[PDB]
């Protein structure tokens, strides 16, 4: 009976909660109390990247740590030479409501998507001099909110149809559809080894998925409301989430629980972007109050603020060699920090 | 102090900047409008009429471009989105106006429509965004209340103790009953509006049948008023 199934679900959920309660023998604070506080970090706007007409929702660093793709709601992707602030490419988009972008690890492609429900893929390195649309991937019902290239032929898209998908770029069709969320999936972070990935939705729950077997492997809870950003710790055995309940939270896949929560009483805006440094000792979060906060992830004290932006910080990305951090906001500007 | 290839790279960047300025010059000259409504609300027919008079399977948004009096408008409506709205609505907190088409010839889903309008009005991101609500399908409502089969008073008890405000203007000449009922619905929506307007944003009621060709001019006039208000706030004239 339906009552029987519901009772079984409650029983298994209680069993999971009990196992999680048993496994938590010490807080990360209790063990991290030993670690010396990082200290205040002052990061300065080394470069300011002007040229976007409207607000920015997305940016992705290149694996060469110098090029930079940025997505604005005016209908542009701009590829910056971050060292010299030159504009390398200016890619006009077919739908202006872009709200994600990715930069292929090889550097031959960038992706973008938004309210059009499409993940368009752009070919940067053509024999002709221009940047052309390589493929348009269709099949999601809700909007696209994040995309991340696994390699030059496989991309993973999260959507607001409660579904993340894995695509074959050569043969447009989907290869795996990841179902199990009950709200809009907002962010997405591929693991370093690219065999797994996590996605946070609008149901306050995040899930570690399996790219090859196609099935959700874990589910994590603890947030009070919908999750806006997610990112892997450089280890690959953890991830941090920022949500509209004004908190960041650090889950761990092996313990399958929550480790620490990054919150302050005076901060009531929702986190919009989360990214780590190389060591993982600094958790950088972009908030709605126009400032990105810097959190010492091991002990959850505020270590830095980067209040240069006027309007809300929508995107935030740390480069692969850890040299710089870039922040894009709704004031049409990108800021590179050291 | 920098090599010749860097001269040419800087020249390339400068041409890109010039193109970006040429794009800004037209980005400031177009106004963005978000269209909202329900399945029974005739907003699709409104879009069709606006496209016809002025100026692909699961695509999630339909941008319609129209102009009037040499001013360019871009009206966007979500086509393949889900029922949830609290996230992809944060993307529209800088549009000129929000057009909310409601079908007022149901009496049944109408309370759901008021709930939706209230959810839109009080949204933490849609402040300072005026709403242009279109009470759609008025002639259907007129005929359906001439029929008299469905009593409005049972769906809404307060309609019995209601009378037409003095500010009415029935132009063609119709039954005072239809005017009283339609102004009652308009006044329900306006009560929801003025409950928390606080002068930051406004609501512009209209009586619209999707066959009407004056919809675009109504949007234009309301947008002109909204721009005038934000300029009065901006040039510090108020």
């Amino acid at each position: 009976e339906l009552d029987q199934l519901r009772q079984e679900a409650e029983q298994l959920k209680n069993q999971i909660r009990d196992a999680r309660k048993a496994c938590a023998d010490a807080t990360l604070s209790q063990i991290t109390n030993n670690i010396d506080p990082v200290g205040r970090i002052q990061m300065r706007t080394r470069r300011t990247l002007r040229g976007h007409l409207a607000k920015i929702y997305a940016m992705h660093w290149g694996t060469d740590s110098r090029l930079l793709v940025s997505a604005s709601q005016d209908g542009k992707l701009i590829i910056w030479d971050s060292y010299t602030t030159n504009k390398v490419h200016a890619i006009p988009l077919r739908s202006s409501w872009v709200m994600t972008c990715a930069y292929a690890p090889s550097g031959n492609y960038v992706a973008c998507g938004g309210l059009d429900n499409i993940c368009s893929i752009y070919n940067l390195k053509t024999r002709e001099g221009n940047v052309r649309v390589s493929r348009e991937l269709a099949g999601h019902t809700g909007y696209l909110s994040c995309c991340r290239f696994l390699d030059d032929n496989q991309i993973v898209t999260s959507s607001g149809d409660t579904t993340c998908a894995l695509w074959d770029i050569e043969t447009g069709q989907q290869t795996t559809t990841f179902t199990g969320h009950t709200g809009d999936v907002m962010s997405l972070s591929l693991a370093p080894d690219t065999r797994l990935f996590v996605s946070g939705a609008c149901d306050a729950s995040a899930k570690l998925w399996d790219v090859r077997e196609g099935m959700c492997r874990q589910t994590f809870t603890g947030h009070e409301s919908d999750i806006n950003a997610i990112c892997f710790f450089p280890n690959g055995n953890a991830f941090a989430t920022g949500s509209d309940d004004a908190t960041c939270r650090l889950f761990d896949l092996r313990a399958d629980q929550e480790l620490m929560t990054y919150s302050h009483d005076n901060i009531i805006c929702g986190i919009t972007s989360v990214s780590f440094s190389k060591s993982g000792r600094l958790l950088l979060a972009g908030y709605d109050d126009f400032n990105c906060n810097v959190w010492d992830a091991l002990k959850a004290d505020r270590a830095g603020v980067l209040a240069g932006h006027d309007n809300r910080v929508s995107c935030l990305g740390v480069t692969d060699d850890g040299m710089a951090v870039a922040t894009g906001s709704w004031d049409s500007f990108l800021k590179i920090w050291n | 102090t920098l090599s010749a290839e860097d001269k040419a790279a800087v020249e390339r960047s400068k041409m890109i900047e010039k193109q970006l300025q040429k794009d800004k010059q037209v980005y400031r000259a177009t106004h963005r409008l978000l269209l909202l409504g329900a399945d029974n609300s005739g907003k699709s027919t409104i879009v069709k009429q606006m496209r016809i008079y002025h100026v692909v399977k699961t695509s999630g948004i339909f941008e319609t471009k129209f102009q009037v009096d040499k001013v360019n408008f871009h009206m966007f409506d979500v086509g393949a989105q889900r029922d949830e709205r609290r996230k992809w609505i944060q993307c529209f907190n800088d549009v000129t106006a929000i057009i909310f088409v409601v079908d007022s010839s149901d009496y049944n889903r109408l309370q759901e429509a008021l709930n939706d309008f209230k959810s839109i009005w009080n949204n933490r991101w849609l402040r300072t965004i005026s709403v242009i609500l279109f009470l759609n399908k008025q002639d259907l409502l007129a005929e359906k209340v001439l029929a008299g089969k469905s009593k409005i008073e049972d769906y809404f008890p307060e309609f019995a103790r209601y009378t037409t405000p003095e500010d009415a203007t029935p132009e063609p000449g119709e039954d005072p009953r239809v005017t009283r009922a339609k102004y009652f619905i308009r006044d329900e929506f306006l009560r929801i509006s003025t409950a928390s307007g606080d002068g930051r944003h406004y609501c512009y009621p209209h009586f619209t049948c999707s066959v009407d060709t004056e919809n675009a001019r109504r949007i234009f006039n309301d947008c002109r008023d909204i721009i005038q208000r934000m300029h009065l706030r901006q040039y510090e004239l108020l």
């Epitope: 110098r66 090029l67 030479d81 030159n86 390398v88 024999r127 002709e128 001099g129 221009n130 | 920098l2 090599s3 010749a4 290839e5 860097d6 001269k7 040419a8 790279a9 020249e11 390339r12 041409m15």
Partner: single-chain antibody, 229 residues
């Protein structure tokens, strides 16, 4: 990509000619294009240069007022105007394509060339001392006067291979980067003044004349050429 060029022939001295370079198959307006010439039996020599947007124009010291370079982007052609032709202007003129941004490969395409016949300083000099040399390994060398390594970290040295019957093709740009389409056999190295190009295993299609070029500062001087037989 293809660059077909025309407008050359027998010319009486003191006359004038206008060369053209009709381009098809690439975004012409975003490429800065050069004219390079070579005397019937000598090495290549740079002539002029016009930039994207037509804002930067350079000329050789030997054509500084005699010549005039101009482009027509909508018509997608490149022109070179020549006045008061002398007997040192007998050469085949090449149309070269070059785009400049981070990571780009300038001089990556060369046109087939046009022949022009005329009837009867403080710039970097690069010398290829060797003038001649299947399955073996060859190590064509090169030398320069001023150091080519810039403060950027780049070493603006280019390698071109001219097969016995056609136009040069780019093999290595900025001393280390193999161009698109060149096999993995070719590789380049250097230090700032002395450079070398390595072919790991020859083939019957690797025979020709190897030319070097510097892009550090205009004019672009080339080098005599190394022959493989």
């Amino acid at each position: 990509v293809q660059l077909v060029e025309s407008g050359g022939g027998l010319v009486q001295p003191g006359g004038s000619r206008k060369l053209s370079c009709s381009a098809s198959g690439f975004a012409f307006s975003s490429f800065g294009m050069h004219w390079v010439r070579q005397a019937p039996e000598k090495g290549l020599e740079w002539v002029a240069y016009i930039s994207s947007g037509s804002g930067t124009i350079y000329y050789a010291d030997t054509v500084k007022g005699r010549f005039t370079i101009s482009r027509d982007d909508p018509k997608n052609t490149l022109f070179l105007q020549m006045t008061s032709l002398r007997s040192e202007d007998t050469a085949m003129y090449y149309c070269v394509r070059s785009i400049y941004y981070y990571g780009s490969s300038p001089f990556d395409f060369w046109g087939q060339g046009t022949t022009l016949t005329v009837s009867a300083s403080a710039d970097i000099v690069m010398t290829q001392a060797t003038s001649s040399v299947p399955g073996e390994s060859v190590s064509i060398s090169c030398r320069s006067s001023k150091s080519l390594l810039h403060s950027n970290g780049n070493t603006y040295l280019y390698w071109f291979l001219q097969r016995p019957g056609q136009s040069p093709q780019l093999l290595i740009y900025r001393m280390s980067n193999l161009a698109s389409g060149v096999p993995d056999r070719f590789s380049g190295s250097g230090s700032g003044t002395a450079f070398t190009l390595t072919i790991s295993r020859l083939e019957a299609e690797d025979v020709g004349v190897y030319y070097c070029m510097q892009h550090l500062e205009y004019p672009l001087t080339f080098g005599a050429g190394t022959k493989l037989e």
